[PDB]
From Swiss-Prot:
Family under the similarity heading: Belongs to the dihydroorotate dehydrogenase family. Type 2 subfamily.
The protein, known as: Dihydroorotate dehydrogenase (quinone), mitochondrial
Chief subcellular location: mitochondrion
Subunit structure: Monomer.
Binding residue positions for FMN: A66, G67, F68, D69, K70, S90, N151, N182, K225, T253, G276, G305, Y326, T327
Gene label: DHODH
Catalytic activity: (S)-dihydroorotate + a quinone = orotate + a quinol
Top-rank lineage group of the source organism: Eukaryota
Mitochondrial intermembrane side: 2-365
Organism name: Homo sapiens
One GO process term, biological-process aspect: 'de novo' UMP biosynthetic process
NCBIfam families: PRK05286.1-2, PRK05286.2-5, pyrD_sub2
Protein residues bound to substrate: K70, N115, R116, Y117, G118, F119, N182, V183, S184, S185, P186, N187, N254, T255
Length: 365
């Protein structure tokens, strides 16, 4: 352990959390990150951490999950923090405010967060201009193994979700290495029912058709992000449609609307998606199931409650090619990225794996 990790986890982050409400802390974090005001990223990525997936090289397999940088403002500072890939969003076609405040809650005794932001978004046009302004810099980053993903949502007033997602494909698809069809937000009425078989097949057919109409050089991979709250029938159906249509990968999982037994935080009954440690093994089991249902043929990005190298390796061994985190950053701060990477490398070596690639799906073999 480095000095920063302990100092941030034991002194800096508790003091910030005592001074600022959760959404103010989030906005300040985005601002400091966007300006590069961040502790010295003291970890050199070993070649063991490199992963080739989704038509790209990833210098390390630890990404920032959607929701931290909703409007594409802090992309370069997130690479400086040490993430191997960045996902921005969710972005909706038109700007919209999201739910009334308060809409984010800390559950520190659970190492968890509840949020009901409701897709607060600057809109596609604003994000489009932000990404265009650094598009060549991102081309170089991607070439160097630091790809960019864009997570697409839908407006609250939209009549047909498929036209919302199609517009996101047309506008931000050419600026992304991969797109994410977010059909699993718990905070937009009726959104998650897009996960059922008949609506999903029509929706994803339209999204793939639009993606295929982009010029080859600007054509992203398309992934679907699913909830952890699905029935077995839902998961079977999603796996079936993903394979029938040639979807490029899955993100597993979004936040949960459940409230597992044992939560201690005073705010556990707030409405919203729960993230962090109480989500961890629910997410890992959903990875394990979706990997088996897709025969290991569909790349998975595993996400939910990762704060250590062991947590990351469990998801990789369950079938994730890549992992993301968000909530751990809100408790440990920026040092958590280097921490997860260093512990993952040590554990790979300890378990006899030549690299991350050899551990993907290793529990199933
Ligand atoms: C405050 C907050 C906002 C989020 N907003 C989004 C979002 O806009 N789009 C999305 O697909 N996921 C969103 N998520 C979900 C995360 O991307 C991730 O799936 C989830 O939080 C589990 O990972 P974690 O336990 O490491 O935080 C949000 C999470 C949090 C905590
Ligand atoms: C300390 C620091 C230095 C340089 C750059 C960034 C940081 C930093 C500081 C705060 C956070 C943070 C905190 C919280 C919270 O609830 O307390 C969040 C968050 C981010 N996003 N959502 N929420 C609820 C993240 C990172
Ligand atoms: C009517 C639409 C007005 C613009 C959309 C609102 C943007 C919300 C900004 C919140 C940013 N953040 C995720 C960091 O809290
Ligand atoms: C306070 C940090 C604790 C980390 C581990 C907490 C255990 C969380 C268990 C999740 C609940 N579950 C869905 C599995 O029943
Ligand atoms: C988001 C609030 C952060 C407060 C503390 C941030 C410390 C800044 C890191 C130090 N330095 C600028 C040299 O990277
Ligand atoms: C082909 C090798 C696959 C895994 C080997 C290393 C695993 C070490 C721990 C195994 N375990 C005791 C947890 O079942
Ligand atoms: O904007 C939000 O409320 C939000 C979106 C999403 O996909 N997941 C989440 O937990 N929150
Ligand atoms: Cl373009
Ligand atoms: Na805000
Ligand atoms: Na089944
Ligand atoms: Na099908």
């Amino acid at each position: 352990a480095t000095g920063d990790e302990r100092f941030y986890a034991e002194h800096l982050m508790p003091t910030l959390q005592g001074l600022l409400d959760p959404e103010s802390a989030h906005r300040l974090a985005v601002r400091f990150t966007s300006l590069g005001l961040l502790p010295r990223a003291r970890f050199q990525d070993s070649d063991m951490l490199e992963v080739r997936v989704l038509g790209h090289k990833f210098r390390n397999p630890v990404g920032i999950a959607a929701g931290f940088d909703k409007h594409g403002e802090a992309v370069d500072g997130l690479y400086k923090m040490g993430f191997g890939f960045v996902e921005i969003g969710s972005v909706t076609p038109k700007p919209q405010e999201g739910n009334p405040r308060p809409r984010v809650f800390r559950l520190p005794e659970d190492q968890a967060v509840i949020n009901r932001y409701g897709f607060n978004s600057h809109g596609l046009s604003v994000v489009e201009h932000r990404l265009r302004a650094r598009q060549q810099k991102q081309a170089k980053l991607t070439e160097d193994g630091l790809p960019l993903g864009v997570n697409l949502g839908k407006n609250k007033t939209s009549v047909d979700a498929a036209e919302d997602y199609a517009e996101g494909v047309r506008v931000l698809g050419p600026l992304a290495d991969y797109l994410v069809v977010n059909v699993s937000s718990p905070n937009t009425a009726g959104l998650r029912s897009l996960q059922g078989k008949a609506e999903l097949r029509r929706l994803l057919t339209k999204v793939l058709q639009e993606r295929d109409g982009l010029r080859r050089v600007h054509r992203p991979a398309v992934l679907v992000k699913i909830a952890p709250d699905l029935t077995s029938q839902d998961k079977e159906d999603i796996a079936s449609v993903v394979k029938e249509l040639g979807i490029d990968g899955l993100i597993v999982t979004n936040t949960t609307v459940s409230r597992p037994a044992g939560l201690q935080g005073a705010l556990r009954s707030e409405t919203g998606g729960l993230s962090g440690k109480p989500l961890r093994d629910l997410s890992t089991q959903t990875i394990r199931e979706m990997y088996a249902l897709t025969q290991g043929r569909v790349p998975i990005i595993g996400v939910g409650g990762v704060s250590s190298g062991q947590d990351a390796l469990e998801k990789i061994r369950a079938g994730a090619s890549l992992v993301q985190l968000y909530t751990a950053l809100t408790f440990w701060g920026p040092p958590v990225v280097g921490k997860v990477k260093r512990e993952l490398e040590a554990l790979l070596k300890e378990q006899g794996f030549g690299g991350v690639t050899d551990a993907i799906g290793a529990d199933h073999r």
